[PDB]
Design an enzyme around this catalytic site. Structure first.
Site, short mmCIF file in Angstrom:
data_model
loop_
_atom_site.label_atom_id
_atom_site.label_comp_id
_atom_site.label_asym_id
_atom_site.label_seq_id
_atom_site.Cartn_x
_atom_site.Cartn_y
_atom_site.Cartn_z
N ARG A 46 -12.05 -3.07 8.89
CA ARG A 46 -11.41 -4.38 8.75
C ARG A 46 -10.73 -4.72 10.07
O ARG A 46 -10.34 -3.81 10.81
CB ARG A 46 -10.31 -4.37 7.66
CG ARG A 46 -10.81 -4.32 6.23
CD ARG A 46 -9.69 -4.01 5.24
NE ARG A 46 -8.96 -2.78 5.59
CZ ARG A 46 -9.29 -1.56 5.20
NH1 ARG A 46 -10.37 -1.36 4.45
NH2 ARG A 46 -8.56 -0.51 5.57
N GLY A 47 -10.54 -6.01 10.32
CA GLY A 47 -9.88 -6.46 11.54
C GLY A 47 -9.33 -7.86 11.48
O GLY A 47 -9.49 -8.56 10.46
N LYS A 48 -8.71 -8.28 12.59
CA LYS A 48 -8.20 -9.64 12.78
C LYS A 48 -9.45 -10.47 13.06
O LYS A 48 -10.24 -10.09 13.94
CB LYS A 48 -7.22 -9.71 13.98
CG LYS A 48 -6.06 -8.71 13.95
CD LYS A 48 -4.84 -9.22 13.19
CE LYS A 48 -3.75 -8.18 13.07
NZ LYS A 48 -3.02 -7.97 14.35
N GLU A 51 -14.46 -8.69 8.95
CA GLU A 51 -14.75 -7.51 8.14
C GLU A 51 -16.17 -7.05 8.56
O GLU A 51 -17.10 -7.86 8.52
CB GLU A 51 -14.68 -7.82 6.65
CG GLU A 51 -13.89 -6.79 5.86
CD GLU A 51 -13.60 -7.14 4.41
OE1 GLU A 51 -14.49 -7.70 3.74
OE2 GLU A 51 -12.49 -6.80 3.94
N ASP A 155 -11.57 -9.85 26.51
CA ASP A 155 -11.10 -8.84 25.55
C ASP A 155 -11.74 -7.47 25.81
O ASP A 155 -12.07 -6.73 24.87
CB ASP A 155 -11.23 -9.30 24.07
CG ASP A 155 -10.41 -8.54 23.04
OD1 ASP A 155 -9.37 -7.94 23.42
OD2 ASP A 155 -10.78 -8.56 21.84
O1 LIG Z 1 -17.94 -8.20 17.01
C1 LIG Z 1 -18.96 -7.67 17.40
O2 LIG Z 1 -19.76 -8.22 18.26
C2 LIG Z 1 -19.47 -6.38 16.84
C3 LIG Z 1 -20.73 -5.88 17.18
C4 LIG Z 1 -21.16 -4.65 16.72
C5 LIG Z 1 -20.34 -3.88 15.89
N1 LIG Z 1 -20.78 -2.57 15.57
C6 LIG Z 1 -20.13 -1.55 14.97
N2 LIG Z 1 -18.88 -1.65 14.57
C7 LIG Z 1 -18.44 -0.42 14.07
C8 LIG Z 1 -17.04 -0.28 13.62
C9 LIG Z 1 -16.47 0.99 13.47
C10 LIG Z 1 -15.15 1.12 13.13
C11 LIG Z 1 -14.33 -0.02 12.91
C12 LIG Z 1 -12.96 0.08 12.54
C13 LIG Z 1 -12.21 -1.05 12.34
C14 LIG Z 1 -12.78 -2.31 12.48
C15 LIG Z 1 -14.09 -2.45 12.83
C16 LIG Z 1 -14.91 -1.31 13.05
C17 LIG Z 1 -16.28 -1.41 13.41
C18 LIG Z 1 -19.37 0.57 14.10
S1 LIG Z 1 -20.86 0.01 14.76
C19 LIG Z 1 -19.10 -4.38 15.50
C20 LIG Z 1 -18.67 -5.61 15.96
O3 LIG Z 1 -17.43 -6.02 15.57
#
Ligand SMILES: O=C(O)c1ccc(Nc2nc(-c3ccc4ccccc4c3)cs2)cc1O
Length: 326
Positions: A46-48, A51, A155
């Protein structure tokens, strides 16, 4: 009478010499496909603003990442989409595979290539001097490319650098804060994560450029070579500038605010104090010395500078002796 104007030293007019279709994201028409093609498997986090889920494409049996966005600002979603489509396929840029909406929720969702990420805290221990040089060069490939495309990421930080260490693959993710560079444009300073925020943001100098990402990359390099995460540990945006001043010194800070005629916020009066310019060698210890070198310190010194114009561009940085081994 007002702040002195500034412009990027590289790719200054790349957007000016392009038709409005390229950079006018507010006019870009997004086509939202059907989310039924994707089956959600597990929550990655989850994030700002979002999801993030691991999913499976029902049409080709491939794993993907689905980022379900909280529709807080329509222009912001259009901006992220337009930038992602513009950069699609670029070296070490995350690939936007699709744009979908679930039929019942209608929630905006972005589909990305799956990257088998190695948590930065686990990678932190096993990284070698060569690994840091290699991965820094890969982020530089991403940065020089997106800057040439008239885009500033805004960022750059470890969470937004996905590394599949086993396959030595790097991807610059989350373009949700990215912007199109227009010479002379005044931007919102409420960008980047506190630790990676450039002095220009902290002093409220709006006419910034690609050089902001060069500051952030410096903060990331400084945390990697010295094994000190984060390198500048601010407790708030005003304190963040004090932490920088504690290393870079207050003399060069006042030189910066004077070169650009910046009105320093009165909240900085009781906390800034007086600080000498520290030598980068003071950060070398038993635990990190095997990652530090004269070349690494020379490169770091050329990135972490108050004056955004004085920082190496991504292309100049790629020619630095620190990358001769890669
Ligand atoms: O925004 C973007 O372009 C974008 C592109 C690819 C991607 N790939 C991936 N994310 C994760 C991941 C792992 C642990 C986490 C913990 C808190 C919150 C989020 C999280 C996201 C694993 S693989 C994620 C993205 O957000």
């Amino acid at each position: 009478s007002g702040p002195v104007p500034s412009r990027a030293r590289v790719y200054t007019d790349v957007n000016t010499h392009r038709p409005r279709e390229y950079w006018d994201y507010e006019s870009h028409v997004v086509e939202w496909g059907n989310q039924d093609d994707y089956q959600l498997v597990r929550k990655l986090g989850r994030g700002k603003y979002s999801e993030v889920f691991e999913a499976i494409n029902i049409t080709n049996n491939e794993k993907v990442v689905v980022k379900i966005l909280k529709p807080v600002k329509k222009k912001k979603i259009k901006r992220e989409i337009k930038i992602l489509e513009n950069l699609r396929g670029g070296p070490n840029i995350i690939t936007l595979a699709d744009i979908v909406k679930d039929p019942v929720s209608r929630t905006p969702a972005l589909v990305f290539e799956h990257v088998n990420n190695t948590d930065f805290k686990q990678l932190y221990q096993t990284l070698t001097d060569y690994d840091i040089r290699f991965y820094m060069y890969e982020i530089l490939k991403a940065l020089d490319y997106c800057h040439s495309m008239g885009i500033m990421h805004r960022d750059v930080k470890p969470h937004n650098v996905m590394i599949d260490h086993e396959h030595r693959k790097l991807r610059l993710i989350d373009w949700g804060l990215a912007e199109f560079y227009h010479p002379g444009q005044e931007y919102n300073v409420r960008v980047a994560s506190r630790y990676f925020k450039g002095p220009e943001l902290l002093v409220d100098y709006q006419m910034y450029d690609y050089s902001l990402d060069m500051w952030s990359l410096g903060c990331m390099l400084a945390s990697m070579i010295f094994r000190k995460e984060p390198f500048f540990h601010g407790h708030d945006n005003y304190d963040q500038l004090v932490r920088i001043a504690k290393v870079l010194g207050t003399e060069d800070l006042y030189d910066y605010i004077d070169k650009y005629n910046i009105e320093l916020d009165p909240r900085f009066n009781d906390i800034l104090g007086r600080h000498s310019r520290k030598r980068w060698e003071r950060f070398v210890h038993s635990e990190n010395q095997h990652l530090v070198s004269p070349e690494a310190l020379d490169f770091l010194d050329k990135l972490l500078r108050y004056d955004h114009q004085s920082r190496l561009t991504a292309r100049e940085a790629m020619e630095h002796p620190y990358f001769y081994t890669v």
